[PDB]
Amino acid sequence: AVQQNKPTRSKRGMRRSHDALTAVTSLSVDKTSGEKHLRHHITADGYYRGRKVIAK
Amino acid sequence: SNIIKQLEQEQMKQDVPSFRPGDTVEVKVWVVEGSKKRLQAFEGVVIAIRNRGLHSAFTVRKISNGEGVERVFQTHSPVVDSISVKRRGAVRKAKLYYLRERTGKAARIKERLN
Amino acid sequence: MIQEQTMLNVADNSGARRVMCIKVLGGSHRRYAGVGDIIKITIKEAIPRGKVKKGDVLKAVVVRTKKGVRRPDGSVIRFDGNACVLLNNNSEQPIGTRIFGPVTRELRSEKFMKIISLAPEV
Amino acid sequence: MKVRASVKKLCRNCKIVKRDGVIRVICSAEPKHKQRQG
Amino acid sequence: MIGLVGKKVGMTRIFTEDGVSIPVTVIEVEANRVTQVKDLANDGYRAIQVTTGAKKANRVTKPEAGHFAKAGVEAGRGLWEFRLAEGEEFTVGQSISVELFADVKKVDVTGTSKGKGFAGTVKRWNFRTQDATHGNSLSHRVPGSIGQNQTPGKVFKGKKMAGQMGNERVTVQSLDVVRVDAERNLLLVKGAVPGATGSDLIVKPAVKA
RNA sequence: ACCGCCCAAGAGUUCAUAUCGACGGCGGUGUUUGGCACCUCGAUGUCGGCUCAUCACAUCCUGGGGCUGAAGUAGGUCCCAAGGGUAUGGCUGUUCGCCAUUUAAAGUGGUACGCGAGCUGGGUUUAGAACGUCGUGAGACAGUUCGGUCCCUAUCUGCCGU
RNA sequence: AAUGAUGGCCAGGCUGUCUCCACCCGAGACUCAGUGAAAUUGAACUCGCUGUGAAGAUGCAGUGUACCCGCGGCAAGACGG
């Protein structure tokens, strides 16, 4: 129930090769003030689908 | 669902009788005897009902001179030719599993003659 | 639906009220056999002055199992209790002379035609 | 019919036949007389 | 008579005149289409490419649009080759009728089965159970022993192992005939075709003759 | 050791190989009882049950086929043929075994006398206590009966899916 | 006689103990966030099959086969710990 011989350095990278992170890069640009906001998300100013909902 | 809807909208029975879970019931089921056909009685009560249309059920509980041979019919299979009522029952709930072990002197229920 | 040592009631006038499934006939491994199945079983009791005595062994011609009986529309006439009718070794036919209670028309083939002559039911 | 390493003629009518590479025994007199090399 | 496959509508128990019960497969097949030539002439082996069904105007992509534009045809849900049996032989572009099952007396079913994911081995292959008591040590459903010892000491390829099974294509052939309605394009058959209900499963006239 | 076979007394009513065989003869395989001590004693867990298997064929039924002191039937024997199939209970730890009753029929063998990093422990090699016997004892018996602790979060090979 | 968490057997009742398993509800097992271990370790680019050998081969001769790398499972082997 254990490794029997110590693995090499190089392998450790490859096992780590798919775990590379994925960037978003799909920024959405709003129509009211233009503050960058995630597509489908109310803006940091609480805006989405253009209108001022909530209010904070 | 609209496929068989017309398919079997024309295969459910035509003129079924009156029962409850506990109404007396007898499915004249055309069975094989010799070389000719005739009707033979299976009179009983409903202990269990299935409002499912053609694949549904209406239950008959006979007493077979001590040990019955129990039947789960298809109301809408033409193998059930017809039903002729002798009396309905007075039931509360949906499924009269109690109709069986209830026997002899007490086995009866009154008529729900309303 | 009679299996090793099946509780067995008797439909006949022999006196034995006792039978018990020990071997199905007709083919190896034959598991759930009833209705018109013949199997090897042994008698465990009889009436005082009956034609069998404690220990006599025979097979079976079934007429009831707790599983009841299917019919042309998928419908079933279902048995309440596992009560049965034995058979001879050589002449077949239930070893008795008077039989009572439900059998199965599935036993109707002129081989058990003996019983089908005079029954109260089927 | 007889198969062993020992095959021979036994009566007046036979033919021990080399049918390929293993010796044999036949009979043209009696059914018992048939063999091959073993 | 090539086969005709449909969407696994659902199923029924078909009721008759004299106590006959027919729980039948229920399936949808539209007017089929063979869409191309396959044979010696352009490929050297003969086949009839067939799409059936429809697609919403905006989603017919230009090359496939061209594929159908070059075809000049409505979109159908998929193009199938029927390998030409020296009486079988088609060319691009025809919209089909169903008479090709005039008698058949048996057809096929092949398509994605019911969704199951990792089914249990107990179900995939009908293995046995260990006892549930008298000291069972956490083994109420394990597969048990699989292989031998210091001798070959390797696991034979193909060994029936538990895992995902079903929810996939499944040929179902030499299948009795019950009933159809060309006017409705259903297929209602004693015995019910595999797959998820609503599936397409390859229904073809019997290949076991 | 087993099977195989070589000789021909003889038998077999006839007929040494229908089916048997004196005494003697020459092989094959490596499974029973054996020999030898080259490796493992800074650890290669014992009997048997349960789930899952797999091939060889010196062929059990089926298939073929020949012959037969094989009328039909049912046998006896020899050649071909390895696709498929191959019982349920009682008795004792049992394997073994015996027995009850079925079936086409309950083939023989290798695989660490398969399989515990998949299960159990009833048997067999621990501490308690007993009887018979054996010695002055301490205790022994390879004689018998009651009770009694089993670990692994899967690196690599491999295999199933994705 | 009475007594016994005592030894052995045979009746009644009982029921998923079994032929033969089906469904359902809960707590983990799986994805995202944060924190964050152990036994072990000559060195390794770490395939199968016949044969030979301190006499039972991944690493020898001859020979077949096989694009690079993960993720969920399984436990025959690595004389595994």
From Swiss-Prot, chain E:
One of its GO terms (biological process) is ribosomal large subunit assembly. One of its GO terms (molecular function) is structural constituent of ribosome. The modification N5-methylglutamine is found at residue 150. The modification N6-succinyllysine is found at residue 38. PROSITE patterns: RIBOSOMAL_L3. GO terms for cellular component: cytoplasm; cytosol; cytosolic large ribosomal subunit. Keywords: Methylation, Ribonucleoprotein, Ribosomal protein, RNA-binding, rRNA-binding. Methylated by PrmB. Gene3D superfamilies: 3.30.160.810, Translation factors. InterPro entries: Ribosomal_uL3, Ribosomal_uL3_bac/org-type, Ribosomal_uL3_CS, Transl_B-barrel_sf. Belongs to the universal ribosomal protein uL3 family. One of two assembly initiator proteins, it binds directly near the 3'-end of the 23S rRNA, where it nucleates assembly of the 50S subunit. Part of the 50S ribosomal subunit. Forms a cluster with proteins L14 and L19. In pull-down experiments interacts with CedA. This is Large ribosomal subunit protein uL3. It comes from Escherichia coli (strain K12). The gene is rplC.
